[PDB]
Design a protein around this ligand. Structure first.
Ligand SMILES: NC(=O)c1ccc[n+]([C@@H]2O[C@H](COP(=O)([O-])OP(=O)(O)OC[C@H]3O[C@@H](n4cnc5c(N)ncnc54)[C@H](O)[C@@H]3O)[C@@H](O)[C@H]2O)c1
Ligand SMILES: NC(=O)c1ccc[n+]([C@@H]2O[C@H](COP(=O)([O-])OP(=O)(O)OC[C@H]3O[C@@H](n4cnc5c(N)ncnc54)[C@H](O)[C@@H]3O)[C@@H](O)[C@H]2O)c1
Lengths: 308, 307
């Protein structure tokens, strides 16, 4: 049975991942870690430990002391704050990656690091985006994730490092601080129950790949539990659905016909939305290991409304 | 009349580049720098300065004090030595790049960093390799050179960083002191002193190659090129491509009693198969008017003169 450390696990996805993994391995075999102070409920969910990813010395301690064998590298600065703070995002994303790589390599850890729809550029295929294609993002966040894919794979060929990487689409979850380019699709459900009116910051027909949190984490666990031999590559696209604000607004209106939508586009967020793909092609992920999504637009909307 | 700094310029290319740039912009306007001790003759060529690329604070000094406006970033650990020392090669090639980037952006410096045929992998187009394609190199040096491309271009779209980049083929020069493309240099030093060279690559293994003069000239010309005539910031630079057997063929036009014994080192062979065979330089020729001068015939003639 494996001992798990989750790096930067107090963000949008981390807590959910902790819950899924603790159910699979036991409360005490999953160690949650971040640099921020944890909410009372999450601290009492199981072991939590302060971990600064830029501090390499501290990662060795934690991995040795807690006999960690599985690591999920969730700590990063995303496309939102990344652009405003290029120096720090470079540090946390690239130097942080190296440290996690080194520790896992030295101590025989199976390593998960997410990549993103932001790892693609304007010169990339967008309808759909395959697993192997031109990657030339013009965001520090994406560039660093391209680096994550390449470095991770190299460490698998140079050393026997068990590196596994899923390119997450925009993830939708119930109670998620703001964002964030794909953030409208989280906030919309808040305003749907609050007033019945929501101001959207992307164009009505901006198609992006999306996914419910349950699917995202289920994929994450599955690929990690997968037999090595069935993995022809180490970075996979993961896919569930693609939609637009307009298409989401209809699915909402199926339950709440009164729901009203307005628009005020943010050019900054709109510009990087246009640079991303519209659909993710996960042929390889479905073929190699048994990837199937459980949530599409109707059921995603149903569950999200069930939290209000 | 720009003030130039050549980083890590005691290797194969930096000295020749110093010579070219000094004849163009002035002896005292081009500073050569490295961490190693410079030979006597090169020390007296023009201004030389110790500069460790890992030392960010020292780069800030040098750039401000010597009022640098043009930087050519040659410091690296190459494909062969990098696989031996991954942690070191990661520092020098990655944090070294990061430092060079931060300095060039802050002080409004024209930055040149060369990429390589090594920036491609087994999943890439190989015959010929275009400017835009899949890049999945399976060497640390390769992974850091892709990172070089993306970071440099990002800083161009993010800040106002004038980042200009060329992907060199394996460069050939007479004055060269154990890489992958090394065979094409060690051959002449064993060709004039007749007449059998042991090659460590298979008879029909094509790689893009170029003579130092063309490499250095393109490097200058791309920097001299007007910014608005540049549709991209990373260009393939091409001249010729050959196999070991083809190289032995053109040597016979000058010395017919030449012979090759192929004893192939699989480690360098494998990564030679992971590299492209030809580089397409359409964009280079189109945008800033690139044209090579040395093809296989006149490459051999020039090299033999040095023996
Ligand atoms: N959420 C999505 O929709 C989505 C989409 C694509 C990819 N991803 C990827 O999934 C991973 C996790 O996603 P997320 O949305 O939960 O991120 P998030 O922004 O919600 O949380 C990131 C966490 O990293 C932590 N962190 C920052 N600097 C740190 C340091 N030096 N040491 C330790 N921790 C540090 C932050 O405190 C934060 O809790 C990221 O790598 C992200 O790129 C997420
Ligand atoms: N020559 C080729 O075949 C070729 C082909 C493609 C690309 N390139 C690129 O061209 C550039 C120059 O290549 P080269 O043939 O001179 O390589 P080289 O190995 O001969 O020279 C590298 C130089 O950088 C110096 N250096 C190493 N670490 C340093 C540090 N921390 N601080 C300062 N200096 C340091 C070394 O002392 C050495 O003199 C490199 O960026 C290389 O990636 C070369």
């Amino acid at each position: 049975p494996p001992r798990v450390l989750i790096t930067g696990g107090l963000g949008q996805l981390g807590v959910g991942l902790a819950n899924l993994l603790r159910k699979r391995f036991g409360k005490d075999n999953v160690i949650l870690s971040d640099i921020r102070k944890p909410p009372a409920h999450v601290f009492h969910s199981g072991p939590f430990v302060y971990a600064n990813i830029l501090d390499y010395k501290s990662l060795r301690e934690i991995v040795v002391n807690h006999r960690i064998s599985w690591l999920f590298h969730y700590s990063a600065l995303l496309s939102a704050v990344g652009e405003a703070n290029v120096s720090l995002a470079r540090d946390v994303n690239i130097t942080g990656l190296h440290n996690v790589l080194d520790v896992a390599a030295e101590y025989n850890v199976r390593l998960f690091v997410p990549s993103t729809i932001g790892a693609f550029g304007p010169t990339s295929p967008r309808n759909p985006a395959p697993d192997l294609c031109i990657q030339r993002p013009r965001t520090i966040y994406g560039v660093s994730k391209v680096h994550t894919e390449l470095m991770g794979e190299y460490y698998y060929y140079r050393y026997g490092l068990d590196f596994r990487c899923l390119r997450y689409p925009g993830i939708i979850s119930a109670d998620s601080p703001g964002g964030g380019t794909t953030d409208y699709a989280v906030q919309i459900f808040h305003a749907a129950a609050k007033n019945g009116t929501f101001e959207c910051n992307l164009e009505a027909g901006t198609r992006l790949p999306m996914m419910y949190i349950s699917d995202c984490l289920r994929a994450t666990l599955e690929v990690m539990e997968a037999p090595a031999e069935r993995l022809s590559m180490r970075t996979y696209n993961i896919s569930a659905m693609s939609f637009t604000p307009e298409e989401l607004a209809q699915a909402l209106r199926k339950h709440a016909p009164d729901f009203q939508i307005t628009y005020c586009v943010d050019p900054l967020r709109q510009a990087i939305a246009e640079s991303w793909p519209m659909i993710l092609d996960d042929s390889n992920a479905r073929k190699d290991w048994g990837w199937k999504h459980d949530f599409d637009l109707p059921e995603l909307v149903a569950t999200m409304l069930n939290f209000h």
